[PDB]
Amino acid sequence: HSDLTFCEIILMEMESHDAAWPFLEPVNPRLVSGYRRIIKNPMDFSTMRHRLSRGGYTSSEEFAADALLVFDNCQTFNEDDSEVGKAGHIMRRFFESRWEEFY
Numbered sequence: 388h389s390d391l392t393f394c395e396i397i398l399m400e401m402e403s404h405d406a407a408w409p410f411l412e413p414v415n416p417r418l419v420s421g422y423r424r425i426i427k428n429p430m431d432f433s434t435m436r437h438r439l440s441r442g443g444y445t446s447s448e449e450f451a452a453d454a455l456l457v458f459d460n461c462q463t464f465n466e467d468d469s470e471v472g473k474a475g476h477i478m479r480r481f482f483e484s485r486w487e488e489f490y
């Protein structure tokens with residue numbers, strides 16, 4: 388699959404990016420007050436990595452949905468001028484541009 392070939396490329400790039408540090412594992416709701424209540428569908432790169440390694444994606448659109456969810460969740464919970472928020476903006480611009488550079 389050439390669709391699954393690119394998400395693999397773009398995920399590897401997001402995983403190693405400098406600004407990826409808030410998105411490499413799930414947010415622990417025990418550690419973050421309010422997170423369970425505000426964020427209905429948590430998402431992160433390791434979860435996307437797991438879903439890829441298992442064959443859980445069918446189309447690249449499903450992959451795109453999960454990527455965008457990471458950044459929608461980031462902007463729903465974090466302030467744009469917060470440390471995690473700034474990192475999410477850098478990561479979201481990277482994803483959007485890289486995704487468009489292919490499709």
Ligand SMILES: CCCc1c(C(=O)N2CCC[C@H]([C@H](C)N)C2)[nH]c(C)c1C(C)=O
Pocket residue numbers: 408409410411412413414415419422460461464465471
């Ligand atoms: C208060 C900010 C919490 C947060 C992180 C975050 O700090 N992590 C990600 C998981 C563990 C990482 C650790 C340093 N290894 C750090 N990431 C996100 C998306 C959030 C939020 C609330 O949206």
